[PDB]
Structure formats: structure tokens, C-alpha cells
RNA sequence: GGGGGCGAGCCCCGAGGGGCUCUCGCUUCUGGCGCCAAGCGCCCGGCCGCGCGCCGGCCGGGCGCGACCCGCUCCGGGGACA
RNA sequence: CGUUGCCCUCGGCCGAUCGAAAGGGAGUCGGGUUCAGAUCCCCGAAUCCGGAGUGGCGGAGAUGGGCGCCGCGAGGCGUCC
């Protein structure tokens, strides 16, 4: 046989007053440092309070498949990095006194980045699409933008990640993004996105305006209310009906 | 999936580095100003000091007040090529740390006393 | 306990998390004595101390 | 919220069982002991023997259950008044 | 074998610090010696605390009992715990 007698079980009763309790997870009942505790109960306030619609609209962000289309389309029109900038200048300086230097050549189209660059080109109707980030840190930088966009009739969307929006350009975050033009090859793709976007955002802006949305409760309270409602329901439902 | 066993949240033990100074603040190190010399000012030649020398196998000095017995011992050994049994300091009401220094029994105190000048 | 007319009672339990004998100072219920057990909680038996 | 089931109240039931409600999360005769896991389950490194090696042995490790799952305020009590 | 760097592993405290030449607080006593110092100098007997690596040495751990041979026997070897 390959079974010792001696080996036993020795099971521990984790009762009350019995074998001292096992080292279970306490993630819920940890005392958190005042920074953590705050960032968590900021989020709660946003759910608990009555959030007005100019801020609430940024909850309504774009859907995954559409975002992946957009970021693919932007990958074409990311702005020129460093090194690339030197090589563009260096090639021009060599070509001036060597084999005919024209000077201006023809510059390609690219993305437009920060709110101020964008807002001038929604005032000016230069933009075809505007992407906005949903998590700008003081909201006021980007609050008017969607109302301004809908006034000027520029399709706009709200993407997740000021960071991932800002990784199209090569800086930490970016609030906004905009396309003024697009190459003829990629032209039909932008127009496919645009129409899908404006259906979900610009062409229902009245519903967005009205749509308040905080004013939820703690589930722990919600559940307590529902239980009372089930008591009130069973008080007058199973009796008559 | 790393669970909190304890309800505390103590601060995490971050890496911390040694100093790697881009330059030394002070140009070159301060020379020691308490050498074999500056530690032993002079020998007493007092009646009581000579009686200590002649009878107890000691030499009685005045010493710099900052000195340890360890330093004195090392100085006495260095200056007079000698070797010590024990040093036995006090402070004079005057300010000058006196030092009674018992030499080891291979050495005679009166012989060294004659070498250093005093008698 | 100086400055107090009530006597106290060192009552020792077992911490139910760390292997550790925690202890308390109850004010003595009259008729408490040493080598007595002192149960406490919701499901505690309704006797003295 | 479910599991667990010794059981109790109810509902269903084909008497095997299932569902809802309670109940516990299981310790009261003694001036004891009681933590750093047993048990099970699944994986790998090296060495050895069968040689098909996630076959068998020798040595050494890891993860899971054991010790349900999810959640948004640590738990209570107040509270738009103090 | 140390020493350090990194990774994992474990770790409650409880407030930094100051606060007593009468509180707490290891371990020194006899004889001698000076114009003036002595549990402090000298002689002699001690003692505590720290270190002691390479471990300086002994002693303890520990040197049984079995079985098998060979030997007159004291015993020697082989092998099992
Ligand atoms: Mg002090």
C-alpha cells in the first residue's frame, strides 16, 4: 500500500470562541490613507449628488468598436515626432544648394491637439470631426465644447482616456483632438465614422441637455428601501389578489 | 490578486540609494590637529611628580584636555619609543589634564626620565 | 482602584484573531469572584457578571 | 445574494427530492490547551527506474480549495439639525 | 566564509526626545603609601560586562546493543540498528 495510517485530518473549527480565525482577506475593512480614501469617496459623491447635464454628458462616451476605428484612423494623422522634425529640415538644407531647391514642397494633413487650437477651428468650421476626452481634470476646460460643436454643426465624440487620446500625439494627456482634413485614400473612412458619431451625439443634443444623472443611492440603502417595499407589497398584494 | 491580510495599510518599503555626490563639498580632509606631539604638552618635574617616577615606575605629564587615555598611551608609545602599562588621567583645577602613565616593568621610568631631560 | 468605591475585575479573554490573551477591566458586578467565567455577547446567558 | 446542511415553520413533492421562511455560521459543569494548516486537488524543476513518458520511485518547489460570490461609502449612531 | 545589491518572507504597538549625584540600575575588597589624593596610587586577593573569528584547551553531547565471523581468553574485524 501507499497510504500511511499515521496521516490524519486534523480539521479546524473556525467557529466563535473555537479555533482562532483564518487570515482572510480584509480589503473592504482596511483603514486607507487619506489620499486613497478621498479619491474613492469623491467618485461616490458624483454618483450620490444630482449631477447637472453639461458634466453628465461626459459619462456618455464612445463604444469600444467605434473607438478602435477612430484610433486606427488617427494613426495615419499623428503629428511628426522629434527626429522626424530634424530630418525634414536637414533634407531641405541639403537640397537647396545641390539639385534644385523649390522651398515649400507640399505639406501633408495632421491632427489638431489642444482645446484652444480646436475651439478656434470649431469657431471657424475648419474641423470635420472633434474628439474630446471624458476625464479632463478641471471640467471647465471642456464643457462648452460639445455645445459649441453642435452649434457649429461639427460631429464630435467623447473618447475614454485623455491619456490614450494624448498618446496619438506624443504627450502625456490631451484634452481634445480634431481633423481638419484627411487624405483622399482615407477620406471615406472618416465620413463613415463621422455619420455614425453624429447620430449618437450631435443629432440628439436636446436629450443630452435634459439628461441629469447622479442621484443614485448606496446599494446598502437601496436594498433597505426595496426590502421595505417588499414588506409594503406583501402587506397589500397577496391579501387581496 | 494579492489580498490584504491585515486591516492596516503601512507605508511601502521603497528603494533608497546611497549618496553619489557630483562633487566633494570640502576640498580635502581636515588635517588632524591632535597629533603625537600636540597631545603631550610637557612633563611635570614637581617633587610629587619625581617621587611618582622614582618609586612607582611612572612618568607624569601634562596632556591636551581633549585626549583619551587611548590616545595618550599611543602618543607616549610613539614619541618615546616606549611601552605603557596604563594611563591614569585627571584634570587640574587650572585646566590642564594631567596624566600619570605607568610604564611596563621591562622599562625603568628613571632611565626614560633621564632620556627626555627631566630629573 | 484608588478614588473609586467600586472594585474592578481583571477579566482575560482570548483575542479571536491573534494567538494572544487580551484582558479588560470590568467594574465588578456584586457576587463576581475569581476563577469564574464571564460570558459576553448577544447569545450570552442571562446570569450575573 | 447564494452555497452547507443537523434541524424547525411554510409551500411544492413522485417520499427520491426541490423551493421559500427561520437558523447557524456550529463554543456554558471544571482557574486546561488552542497561532505560524492538516486534509484534499491540480501543476512544474532535478535525479533514478520502467521506457510511451504529465507510467512508477527518490528529492525539491508553486498555485487552488480548505477559509462561497458580488458590491459604492470601515463599522455603528445622529443629520440638514447640532 | 564574510560583506554588500536586488527579489520574496515576516513584524502591532504607542510615540521623537528630555525628566532623579536620595527612586530603579551588573560588577571591589583587605593591607600599605602622602605636607595635601586615595574602595582611584602600590602590594595582594577578587569580580562583572563585552569580545573570543580561524574556535585556545579539556569535559558534556557519546560512544551502547545486536547479529555474524575469527581468537584458548583479553579481544580483532564484517555488518545491522
Ligand atoms: Mg534621561
Copy the grid coordinates of residue A112. 489638431
Q: How was this structure determined?
A: cryo-EM
Task: Residue A173: name the closest of A181, A164, A182, A183 by CA.
Answer: A164
Alpha-carbon span A205 to B109, nearest angstrom = 110
Residues paired with B59 in a beta bridge: B101
Q: What does the radius of gyration of chain C's CA atoms come to, in whole angstroms? A: 12
What cell numbers appear for A5 in the block?
495510517
Record the cell numbers describing residue B100, joined without a space.
Answer: 600619570
Distance CA C49, CA C44 (A): 11
H or E element that contains B70 = helix B69-79
Q: Residue A95: CB partners within 8 Å, gap ≥ 6?
A: A101
Kindly give the distance from the C-alpha atom of residue B88 to the centroid of ligand 1, in angstroms, as a whole number.
29
Sign of the four-CA dihedral A175, A178, A183, A185: positive
Percentages helix, strand, coil for chain B (3-state, rounded to 5) are: 30, 20, 50
Task: Of A121, A109, A116, give the one whose Cα is nearest residue A141.
Answer: A116
Class of residue A69 by CB neighbours under 10 A (exposed 0-12, middle 13-18, buried 19+): middle
Query: For residue B5, what are the contacts with CB-CB under 8 A and spacing of at least 6?
Result: A23, A24, A25, A26
- Using an 8 Å Cβ cutoff, are B9 and A34 in contact? no
Q: Which of B66, B62, B60 is nearest to B32 (CA)?
A: B66
A 10 A CB-CB count for A215 gives 10
CB atoms within 10 A of CB A105: 11
How far CA B77 is from CA of B40, B42, B74, in Å, comes to: 11, 15, 5
- Comparing alpha-carbon positions, the chain A residue that sits nearest to B7 is A30
DSSP tag of A202: G
φ, ψ of residue B52 to 5 degrees: the values are -65, -45
> Which has the closest alpha carbon to A90: A77, A82, A79?
A82
Q: Grid coordinates representing C35?
A: 476563577
- Chain B closest-CA separation from residue A43 CA (Å): 21
Strand B84-91: give its sheet, edge to edge.
B40-43, B58-63, B97-103, B84-91
List of E strands, A95-175: 111-112, 129-133, 156-159
Residues contacting A107, CB < 8 A, separation 6+ = none
- Give the Cα separation of B79 and B75 in Å (integer): 6
B78 is written with which cell numbers? 610613539
Rg of the Cα trace of chain B?
A: 26
Cα B22–chain centre separation: 35
Q: Chains with 3 or more CB pairs closer than 8 angstroms to A? A: B, C
Q: Are A135 and A161 in contact (CB under 8 A)?
A: yes
Q: How many Å apart are CA B15 and CA A32, to the nearest integer? A: 22
B93 CA to middle of ligand 1, Å? 29
Instruction: State the Cα–Cα distance between residues A218 and A144, nearest whole angstrom.
Output: 31
From chain B, pick out residues whose CB is under 8 angstroms from the CB of A30.
4, 6-9
Q: Which residues of C touch A21 (CB under 8 A)?
A: 16-17
User: What residues pair up with A158 in beta bridges, in sequence order?
Assistant: A132
Whether B58 and B99 have beta carbons less than 8 Å apart is answered as no
Secondary structure element (H or E) that encloses residue A209, with its range: helix A205-210
Q: Residue A154 burial (CB < 10 Å; 0-12/13-18/19+)?
A: buried
Q: For residue B75, what are the CA distances in angstroms to A15, A92, A201, B67, B95?
A: 74, 79, 92, 10, 20
Looking at beta carbons, which pairs linking A143-146 to residues 24 or more positions away fall under 8 Å?
Answer: A143/A54, A143/A55, A145/A115, A145/A118, A145/A119, A145/A176, A146/A57, A146/A201, A146/A205, A146/A208
Amino acid at each position: 500500500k501507499v497510504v500511511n495510517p499515521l496521516f490524519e485530518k486534523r480539521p479546524k473549527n473556525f467557529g466563535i470562541g473555537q479555533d482562532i480565525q483564518p487570515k482572510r482577506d480584509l480589503t473592504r475593512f482596511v483603514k486607507w490613507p487619506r489620499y486613497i480614501r478621498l479619491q474613492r469617496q469623491r467618485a461616490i459623491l458624483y454618483k450620490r449628488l444630482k449631477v447637472p447635464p453639461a458634466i453628465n454628458q461626459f459619462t456618455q462616451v464612445l463604444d469600444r468598436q467605434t473607438a478602435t476605428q477612430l484610433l486606427k484612423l488617427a494613426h495615419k494623422y499623428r503629428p511628426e515626432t522629434k527626429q522626424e522634425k530634424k530630418q525634414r529640415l536637414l533634407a531641405r538644407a541639403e537640397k537647396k544648394a545641390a539639385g534644385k531647391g523649390d522651398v515649400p514642397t507640399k505639406r501633408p494633413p495632421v491632427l489638431r491637439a489642444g482645446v484652444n487650437t480646436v475651439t478656434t477651428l470649431v469657431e471657424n468650421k475648419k474641423a470635420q470631426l472633434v474628439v474630446i476626452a471624458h476625464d479632463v481634470d478641471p471640467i471647465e476646460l471642456v464643457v462648452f465644447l460639445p455645445a459649441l460643436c453642435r452649434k457649429m454643426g461639427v460631429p464630435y465624440c467623447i473618447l475614454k482616456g485623455k491619456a490614450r487620446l494624448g498618446r496619438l500625439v506624443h504627450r502625456k494627456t490631451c484634452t481634445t483632438v480634431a481633423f481638419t482634413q484627411v487624405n483622399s485614400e482615407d477620406k471615406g473612412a472618416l465620413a463613415k465614422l463621422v455619420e455614425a458619431i453624429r447620430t449618437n451625439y450631435n443629432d440628439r443634443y436636446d436629450e443630452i441637455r435634459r439628461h441629469w444623472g447622479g442621484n443614485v443611492l448606496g446599494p446598502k440603502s437601496v436594498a433597505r428601501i426595496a426590502k421595505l417595499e417588499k414588506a409594503k407589497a406583501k402587506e397589500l398584494a397577496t391579501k387581496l389578489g | 490578486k494579492k489580498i490584504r491580510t491585515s486591516p492596516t495599510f503601512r507605508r511601502p518599503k521603497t528603494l533608497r540609494l546611497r549618496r553619489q555626490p557630483k562633487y566633494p563639498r570640502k576640498s580635502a580632509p581636515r588635517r588632524n590637529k591632535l597629533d603625537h606631539y600636540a597631545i603631550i604638552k610637557f612633563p611635570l618635574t614637581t617633587e610629587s611628580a619625581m617621587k611618582k617616577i622614582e618609586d612607582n615606575n611612572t612618568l607624569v605629564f601634562i596632556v591636551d584636555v581633549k585626549a583619551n587615555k587611548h590616545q595618550i598611551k599611543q602618543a607616549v608609545k610613539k614619541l618615546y619609543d616606549i611601552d605603557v602599562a596604563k594611563v591614569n588621567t585627571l584634570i587640574r583645577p587650572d585646566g590642564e589634564k594631567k596624566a600619570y602613565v605607568r610604564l611596563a616593568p621591562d622599562y625603568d621610568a628613571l632611565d626614560v626620565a633621564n632620556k627626555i631631560g627631566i630629573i | 482602584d484608588p478614588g473609586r468605591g467600586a472594585p474592578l475585575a481583571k477579566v482575560v479573554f482570548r483575542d479571536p484573531y491573534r494567538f494572544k490573551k487580551r484582558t479588560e477591566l470590568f467594574i465588578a458586578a456584586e457576587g463576581i469572584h475569581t476563577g469564574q467565567f464571564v460570558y459576553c455577547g448577544k447569545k450570552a446567558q442571562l446570569n450575573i457578571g
